[PDB]
Swiss-Prot record:
It comes from Homo sapiens (Human). The lineage of its organism: Eukaryota, Metazoa, Chordata, Craniata, Vertebrata. Keywords: Cell membrane, Cytoplasm, Lipoprotein, Membrane, Myristate, Nucleus, Phosphoprotein. This is LanC-like protein 2. It holds the Pfam family LANC_like. One of its GO terms (biological process) is peptide modification. GO terms for cellular component: cortical actin cytoskeleton; cytosol; nucleoplasm; nucleus; plasma membrane.
Amino acid sequence: RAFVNPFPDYEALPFHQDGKIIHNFIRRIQTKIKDLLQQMEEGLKTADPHDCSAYTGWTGIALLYLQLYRVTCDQTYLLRSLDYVKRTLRNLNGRRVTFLCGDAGPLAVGAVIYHKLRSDCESQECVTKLLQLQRSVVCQESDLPDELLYGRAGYLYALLYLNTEIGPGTVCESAIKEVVNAIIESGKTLSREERKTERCPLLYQWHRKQYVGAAHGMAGIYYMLMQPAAKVDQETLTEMVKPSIDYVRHKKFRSGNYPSSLSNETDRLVHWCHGAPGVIHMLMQAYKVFKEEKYLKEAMECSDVIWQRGLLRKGYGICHGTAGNGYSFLSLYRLTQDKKYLYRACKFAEWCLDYGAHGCRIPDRPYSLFEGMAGAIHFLSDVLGPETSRFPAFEL
Ligand SMILES: [Zn+2]
């Protein structure tokens, strides 16, 4: 599942003492980005015309070019992002709600792109249509899950995306509070039916499995609830979210990895979607909000599991691959300024410079943001500037 990580750890260099990446490594990274960009452009020509998702479709490619534009300021990239959103803005049936897999991705990415190209009316039309998803999400009688790829938390992300990328006052805080309350009541309900009201106040399941991790599980729901832009009150944070965070912490393996769901006792997946590379963001965010060192210390422990098991044979992607796990190191570095994690991110990036020379399997969507090439390009573009790195479709 993982390669043997060949690199020595930081103690046993691709940056200077002050944290700045050396010229040679920047140049090697920018060279590969150009290289991979052209392979991605070529392969997307045969990709599925209908998958418009941020996760595996066209909206994800526009997200990459938005990201390229954020970090280079090259207007060429802004314009190219428009080429990819435009594919996605016409078919919308409003049956999927999340930023990653539903209509909120095309719509929120489109609204941001239009706003940076100064056309306010198309920008506003996107936002207006996005908010029409509101009732389907807030309805407690809907079978809709709460998790990030198909549930309330993924819709919540789109709103926070608008208020952080465009600005506060794009989405009404009333509409964010409604979605937050819907998520909270959902977690109270299931936790009562499972008689966990006092041990895990907020409990969630997806397809009747109580997933632990970022993509479909509790760690990603708690992570969004802890976002400063979701404006959750102190009482709900300390009485409802923190004890739920602590409950999942105590389900961790002795190996330091985290299970895929509460029942599963076999330690296999070291992915953003399942395992320590996703749960670590819950812990790091828990450290930002609650400021107790045990949360950071556990994030550091997650980092060591990811350093040893995180170079994956699945591939180089964000969801379950080397780029997504490499982001764990950039995030922890931003939090700690401990250049050990800068080093570890730099080494995973080095692995990505050899993209496709390792005998990794080919993902179904091999050019996509979260399954394929676009995500690796995304991750490489952020190692250039570790201080401003953002995990796509997840950090704000
Ligand atoms: Zn995955």
